[PDB]
Design a protein around this ligand. Structure first.
Ligand SMILES: C[C@](N)(Cc1c[nH]c2ccccc12)C(=O)O
Ligand SMILES: C[C@](N)(Cc1c[nH]c2ccccc12)C(=O)O
Ligand SMILES: C[C@](N)(Cc1c[nH]c2ccccc12)C(=O)O
Ligand SMILES: C[C@](N)(Cc1c[nH]c2ccccc12)C(=O)O
Lengths: 309, 302, 303, 293
């Protein structure tokens, strides 16, 4: 029981929005209908993604994120985004059921300008923090480019991560100390040989490269990085101490952001592949989080947890 | 033209009205509910569009030009593909907590389009629905086409005759093979298998039984259609039957997908609101597949 | 690479009975590989499962630092089960008629799958195999291990939050307020319908507090968790936003997913058998708990 | 029977976590073993299906045309298996890079079977012997090329499809010339490039294309006249080969992506994709003589 299905879902608009340009020009093509529905579906789902995303963005801005009671809702909604993105990557299968030769039979009645022109997808990219002729649309796109990105909102939250406090756990200090010492112990172990020595020097460069705030700041300006040095510390804190209750769900959030990044990538790849199939990365907003995962500090070196709290 | 205008996004993306918000207390998860079901409908529309197109290719009689069989299989396959995506789409709503659902259940369901689909395929069973119940179902249109299958001609290949002959003879040969099992333990077990198999195998030739079961609802194709089907199944390697076989396989897939969709839709209702069925339009085709005639018994084509 | 993965065994495990008997199904190979794959994945599921079971038995579960590992590994099980449900697609690429062409060389069953069912807590083979199956029937099921953990859920303490007391109080009061709302507008068709819903809901809502009913149904098999466990669950369900309950909630959701996937797997496995040869949730309580539709306003406040 | 039939005695006793063997048993390694053990099982099936199609070409049975259904069926099956494999990446995405590092100590890893597959399809000691056979024996691309060259209607003394095509395209372009101006000249260049055997031969040598000029004609014949019974299933075969190409690509992409995730565009059937791109208007497609097949 409920209000009339069609009326509630406003199917009067949804199911009366299908206008085959083939039919309008006289020469009706069967496969065009699929093209309309497919892209109409993508948009419906984009709308939901933006809806979920914008909601999490507020939970950061409105500062509710500070109440760690809200972290479950955050992870849930972000996860949902990845799930939707997966379905969208699968949905490419539907259009793969259309022959290039059949496509050409209606390509003639398609404008080249808006070949992408998914305002919603641009909005999504902007909103997440990735890297057009419109009016009121261009106004919305403006809001997108102007307002605070998820990357931005998460950066702040990451910077406020507990344990970074120097007069507290001094995590970064302890890390720099223990890594420097352990490398030295390795150097003493070294003192095949030439190959081993190379590994050491290479590892050393990488391992010590964090703690070169200057390098980070440069690369941040150069675009190679996007998070603050402090944020990087927040992240690693969460990564290393994820088993710690107050970090368990936060870790999940980070993992989810990385999934969303890769799915987004996959979607673009499939979208490109399809365009070449029909008519013959700097996009990783959370690059830093992937990189943080790569940093191969041995377990023995990870600063041990005091009675803490 | 231009993306939004071409896709008429002005309607599709302005169709989301959370009854929660309208009544004052907006809930976040309702939006998902609207979009999810709005998506199902979009896809139903495409399925009906593809289906109706195949139905015509039968009615208009173009199906007689076997040049059209590729288009038919292609479009029918597409239906199954779309149905698969729909069965996967259930994952999206599984991302909604029953407890969150209850928070909007108080505010705010059968898809006319889905009923139309069921009718159009031939599920036993403003009023567009009427046209659906009245017009020729795919089952009906396929039945006719199956009845006109080549080789069924009695004064020709007399496939059915040859089959009844070869099966009867082979069973007898098996009976002789069994008869000298020296009253063993295995023998009695073997004899049971034989009798069971015999009953099933020879059941196929009891037009009366079929006609009864047809009336009872247990079967849905004509006796002649059953013969058309088996002809295609046994001789599918034969060029003129290769694609036709694909069509039959596809109809069976669509049946099972349709079933899966209903199962998930029921499962979800019990999951949210907290408390094969004669729904296999192509039952006969599944059954035909089961018939375990040895290959050497299948009437030879020469 | 081959040595590390011991492919020397994994490959050279494929013997088409058709070929051995002199014929050749040329599709039997798929049958072997498909089922060989299912088994590989079952092994991993049992491996992950047994690991979670220990984290309960060894009592490490008490350290809520370990809850992440638990949810992670349990989630992984569901992911693997999904892949297994998708893997049915591979065998759907085999014609019944082609199957029959090698079914002749086959006999009428995964120990591993039985082991899984037992281990999770679902209600013949060689000796040593039967020994493993014995361990399965004997050892403590995940359902059992989670029951205990659920019973120790915080807030159930009567001298503490007295959650159940507060709940019975608040539900009784709210229903009464609804009863007062009833006869608020002149007895109508809509009113009569609403009044029915109320009576129905009341019966259900108040049934929750009938320990006797539970105990009976527990004996009858209709339920599987302890009354106390049911309380632990609801505590977690209602107060899942609460930090110490966030991940625990996830664990419960995961157990329910695993149940439904397991169901789906059996359905597809049955469907396939009928397709080829012709012609109950361990965590029922958790699903049921989800159904109980208490309004938010009624949930005992956490202050 | 059961375990014995599936020889699970080998399959389920092939699990040695190097971590455990060296003393430091790591839980996630088991998944690594099973995951890759599964990939290999499926590769074996893909090779099995592939080799089978390859023979049906070599043994010349493909000529019968009754065998085309089996061919498409088995090739389709390959794509299905490849899809499952692309989905299987999800399982390993359930492993944290941080957990991986905790057993990366036991690292050395490329699948002989996958290389064998690539060779067999036609990607440009005793193990090395098998790999040799792979590089030596006739690739599917090769076997399909031959079959494509024998496509009906390419016969110049027959339908002279290519001739008719060149004629009809040239005429229609002229009509357009009599009738954006840049677009025309550009399109013309591309459209007429198809008839430059020299260009093809060069690009074939350069590697940019892989099918024979004649094969290209066979393909287009099938593409344009796919509605024709006797081309219907052949068209399916071509579509399937293209799918297999893209799936293979996807698998490599995910495999690379995973390696970068954990440790920190040339298709065998390029020609077939390209053929699809060449967008001849319907009105131009040479009409089928009363001698249709
Ligand atoms: C009170 C707090 N939620 C603390 C906080 C910030 N970032 C975190 C990351 C992981 C764990 C905790 C935090 C806040 O400052 O918002
Ligand atoms: C000319 C025809 N299409 C012949 C026909 C009918 N049913 C078939 C099944 C399989 C193969 C061919 C047929 C017709 O009579 O429609
Ligand atoms: C310390 C504890 N892990 C407490 C506990 C038990 N069940 C729970 C459910 C949700 C949250 C916490 C618990 C234990 O008693 O083992
Ligand atoms: C008899 C044949 N199968 C002819 C042939 C070759 N390629 C084709 C493509 C489509 C249709 C037919 C063909 C043969 O040469 O084996």
């Amino acid at each position: 029981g409920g209000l009339i299905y069609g009326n509630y879902l406003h199917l009067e608009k949804v199911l009366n929005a299908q206008e085959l340009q083939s039919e309008t020009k006289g020469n009706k093509i069967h496969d065009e209908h699929l093209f309309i529905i497919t892209h109409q579906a993508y948009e419906l789902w984009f709308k939901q993604i933006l809806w979920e995303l914008d909601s999490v963005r507020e939970i950061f801005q409105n500062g509710h994120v500070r109440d760690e009671r809200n972290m479950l809702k955050v992870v849930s909604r972000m996860h949902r985004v990845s799930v939707i993105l997966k379905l969208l990557v699968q949905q490419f299968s539907i259009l793969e059921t259309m022959t290039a030769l059949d496509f050409n039979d209606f390509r003639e009645y398609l404008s080249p300008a808006s070949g992408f022109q998914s305002l919603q997808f641009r909005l999504l990219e902007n909103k997440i923090g990735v890297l057009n002729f419109k009016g009121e649309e261009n106004e919305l796109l403006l809001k997108s480019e102007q307002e605070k990105t998820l990357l931005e909102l998460v950066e702040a939250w990451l910077e406020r991560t507990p344990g970074l406090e120097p007069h507290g756990f001094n995590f970064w200090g302890k890390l720099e100390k223990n890594i420097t010492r352990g490398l030295e112990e390795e150097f003493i172990r070294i003192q095949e040989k030439e190959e081993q020595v190379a590994e050491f020097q290479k590892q050393k460069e990488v391992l010590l490269s964090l703690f070169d705030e200057k390098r980070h700041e440069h690369l941040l300006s150069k675009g190679e990085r996007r998070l603050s040095y402090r944020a990087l510390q927040g992240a690693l804190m969460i990564y290393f101490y994820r088993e710690e209750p107050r970090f368990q769900v936060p870790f999940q959030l980070l993992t989810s952001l990385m999934d969303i990044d890769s799915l987004m990538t996959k979607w673009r790849y499939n979208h490109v592949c399809m365009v070449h199939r029909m008519l013959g990365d700097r996009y990783k907003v959370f690059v830093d989080l992937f990189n943080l995962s790569t940093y191969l500090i041995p377990r023995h070196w990870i600063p041990k947890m005091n009675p803490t709290i």
